[PDB]
């Protein structure tokens, strides 16, 4: 029979990217929609460079250009920043290429947590040479990193080994949550995606609430929802690669945002192949934040299945979603 899964989670957690991985592994890619994602990807390139140059002078302390000759380039991006009907000429990409080379732009980028920057910014700025081509055809990875806000309820159906899987993609930001109750129809499991990398960042709806705290507070609402007593949650502790990069950078300490982290220790009861202990301790702590919520209530009527996920790694999502189907079988 058909298993109906529901992706819940805060904004920009990675739910839509999970479906995109399902369209890579169990349906044949994307229909040629697509070729319009080029516009969405180019909007990301425009959004990233616009957000960084506007932040260089509003961050405290501010960041100047490393080369004063780049001033006319920053003046160009500020003039095209509000234009919604942008043409995307080569002049745009030529300035973005040399602006990203300016160390001041990189310096402002490394402080991105002090403003709102999409997580695909570094990837597309580092892949500007391809995106600027006239015959630029997006890679599957380019399509995974493409960020578009989800409004409404998007449905995706696929089957693996002759069993059907209906998947519901929803919007994560606060105003989209109002419609979530409509998706509570005939749900076999819930896939809650949480952005573990965003422990030092704030959400976009108010620029005040901590993003990881938003996921934790939202996860408690789902777990302790009166209507969801029976429903179990498959917890995707997402963005492990971006989580490792900032733990290995050592600039934003988790303790600064979650003080109880100083006492948490890796439970002696197993890391991956040569995984840095700093990365290990970080991801197991974020897990114990959720597991603490889910162990407090439930009384055995439903359970929570955690997984470490990287929604942009096709091989990872294959492995994670593979034994997800095993969990559904044991539910029988
Ligand atoms: N590097 C990296 N990027 C990720 C990962 N998961 C998601 N992203 C990126 O984050 C961005 C936002 O992901 P998205 O799928 O739109 O989240 P969402 O939950 O659907 O966001 P919303 O629709 O509720 S607002 C995308 O550009 C995606 O590529 C990850 O595990 N690693
Ligand atoms: Mg979405």
Residue numbers in the entry: 41 to 72, 74 to 310, 312 to 374
Copy text verbatim from the article accompanying this structure deposition.
Olfaction, or the sense of smell, is initiated by the stimulation of odorant receptors (ORs) by odorants. Here, we determined the cryo-electron microscopy structures of consensus OR52 (OR52cs), a representative of the OR52 family, in the ligand-free (apo) and octanoate-bound states. Several subtypes of the human OR52 family, including OR52A5, OR52B2, OR52E1, OR52E8, and OR52L1, are known to recognize carboxylic acids, and the consensus OR52 (OR52cs), representing 26 members of the human OR52 family, is also responsive to carboxylic acid odorants.
Subsequently, we verified the substitutability of Gαolf with Gαs in its interaction with OR52cs by bioluminescence resonance energy transfer (BRET) assays and structure determination of Gαolf in the GTPγS-bound state at 2.9 Å resolution. Structural comparison highlighted the high similarity between Gαolf and Gαs particularly in the C-terminal α helix, which is a major GPCR binding site.
